């Protein structure tokens, strides 16, 4: 079984997203929706266009999603001081809290599930070598 | 030198992979999304748009448009579903089959080369072995 790095990373990413959906279930929020909140939380404010690039998802589906999350009271649209035609989306108090709960709920378990087939010895090597690919 | 969790690490390294994929594909005039679609249609010789939406976890709106674009290119043809009659079975043309193979070479080598730039062959081997362990 020889399998190229790129494909392995894809497969392991997808599985992580499966588990994300599972562990986010109690809070009625998908992995896709959650990634959005996080990206918005890393900036203070960000535009849909800028948010599309970071997330790498379709602009239209993202715009529908952004609106779902607005109904949920998690995301609000400020008018861009610079653009005055584009909008800066940011998290609400509710959005920031709901986002932080999601982290607290998902985080420990997802890691523990992903790494159930590995020694803490091997887990460290894996983290180390994945770090090497990034810079 | 900070403890970043496996979950976030895999995301960052995946996202980097996706970006490099886009770069190495511009010369061929075909997007990363369009490329993944061709590969999925390739893997399942014949597939429903619905079934394909599921495999790709994308919007059925985006996909149906994307399918239309690829039909224009002549890489994808629609057959009527013998099982349905309300559905279609998309599949690859010889053209689309060729283009998909050609992209898998063109980005096959170089994506790997760029990703493993800072890694010993022994480290790459160790990396692949540990990633595999996560998948069962």
From Swiss-Prot, chain A:
GO MF: DNA binding; DNA-binding transcription factor activity
Key words, A-Z: Antibiotic resistance, DNA-binding, Repressor, Transcription, Transcription regulation
InterPro entries in alphabetical order: HTH_MarR-typ (IPR000835), MarR/SlyA-like (IPR039422), Tscrpt_reg_MarR-type_CS (IPR023187), WH-like_DNA-bd_sf (IPR036388), WH_DNA-bd_sf (IPR036390)
Gene3D superfamilies in the record: Winged helix-like DNA-binding domain superfamily/Winged helix DNA-binding domain
PROSITE patterns: HTH_MARR_1, HTH_MARR_2
Domain HTH marR-type: 2-135
Known outcome of mutating residue 36 to E: Increased transcription of the region II transcript
UniProt function note: Repressor of the marRAB operon which is involved in the activation of both antibiotic resistance and oxidative stress genes. Binds to the marO operator/promoter site.
Descriptive protein name: Multiple antibiotic resistance protein MarR
Gene name for this UniProt entry: marR
């Amino acid at each position: 079984e020889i399998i190229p790095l790129g494909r392995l990373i894809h497969m392991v990413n997808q599985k992580k997203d499966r588990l994300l959906n599972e562990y986010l279930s109690p809070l009625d929020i998908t992995a896709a929706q959650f990634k959005v909140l996080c990206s918005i939380r890393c900036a203070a404010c960000i535009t849909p266009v800028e948010l599309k690039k970071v997330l790498s998802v379709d602009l239209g589906a993202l715009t529908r999603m952004l609106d779902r999350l607005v109904c949920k009271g998690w995301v609000e649209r400020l008018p861009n001081p610079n653009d005055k035609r584009g909008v800066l989306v940011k998290l609400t108090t509710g959005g920031a809290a709901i986002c932080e709960q999601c982290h607290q709920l998902v985080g420990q378990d997802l890691h523990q599930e992903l790494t159930k087939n590995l020694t803490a010895d091997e887990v460290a090597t894996l983290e180390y070598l994945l770090k090497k690919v990034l810079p």
